[PDB]
Design a protein around this nucleic acid. Sequence first.
RNA 1: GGAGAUCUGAGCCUGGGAGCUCUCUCC
Length: 88
Amino acid sequence: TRPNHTIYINNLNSKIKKDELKKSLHAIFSRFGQILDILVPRTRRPRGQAFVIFKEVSSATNALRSMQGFPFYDKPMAIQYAKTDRTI
RNA sequence: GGAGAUCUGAGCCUGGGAGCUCUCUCC
């Protein structure tokens, strides 16, 4: 995998409501750059993943470096570049 | 077809979870 506009975040707290997770993620990650969209897809098992789609790849690069393993609702976030870029 | 719904709908797969499908609601 190589850098792209989208970061993949998992190990998120499954006990937090979706919309509050999407809101907090936006508030925390927006400092790195403009966010085009935040996705918290409906998993078969309880939600524990999200995609943050930045406008520039550099914003994703810095977002991934800074927030790697950072506590988030009492859990360290595991961050990667999204397998497939989710920008349309 | 599209958009949603399960720690608060379900089966299978996996067995160190970015899997497949169904069901329901709305358009």
